[PDB]
């Protein structure tokens, strides 16, 4: 587990998917049960937030262990395998 690469992995995925993609992503994110702090997730930021900025909002709320699964589930919901398997290799490092 790292600290820079941690948040970097998020942005890297979200810099690959964003154009009209993030618009979907945000909506899918608003479709799953937002847990405690996610319930107050600043949509005002997420609105104008793109790519890096959106990743920032994910690490703004939850712990990496939740996010590393969270971001993946959204990609899964977008039928994104390719770049999601990048996340499954990087973000969600299954160690301990």
Curated annotation (Swiss-Prot):
Coiled coil: none annotated. Expressed in numerous tissues including uterus and ovary, with low levels in heart and brain. Not detected in skeletal muscle. Residues 1-93 form the Pyrin domain. Induction: By bacterial lipopolysaccharides (LPS) and IL1B/interleukin-1 beta in peripheral blood mononuclear cells. It is linked to Hydatidiform mole, recurrent, 1: A disorder characterized by excessive trophoblast development that produces a growing mass of tissue inside the uterus at the beginning of a pregnancy. It leads to abnormal pregnancies with no embryo, and cystic degeneration of the chorionic villi. Directly interacts with CASP1 and IL1B. Inhibits CASP1/caspase-1-dependent IL1B secretion. Belongs to the NLRP family. This is NACHT, LRR and PYD domains-containing protein 7. It comes from Homo sapiens. The lineage of its organism: Eukaryota, Metazoa, Chordata, Craniata, Vertebrata. The chain holds residues 1 to 96 of 980 of the full protein.
């Amino acid at each position: 587990m790292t600290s820079p690469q941690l948040e970097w992995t998020l942005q890297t995925l979200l810099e690959q998917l964003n154009e009209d993609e993030l618009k979907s992503f945000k909506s899918l994110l608003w479709a799953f049960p937002l847990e405690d702090v996610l319930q107050k997730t600043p949509w005002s930021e997420v609105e104008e937030a793109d790519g890096k900025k959106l990743a920032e909002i994910l690490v703004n709320t939850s712990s990496e262990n939740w996010i590393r699964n969270a971001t993946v589930n959204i990609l899964e919901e977008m039928n994104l395998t390719e770049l999601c398997k990048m996340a499954k290799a990087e973000m969600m490092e299954d160690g301990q």
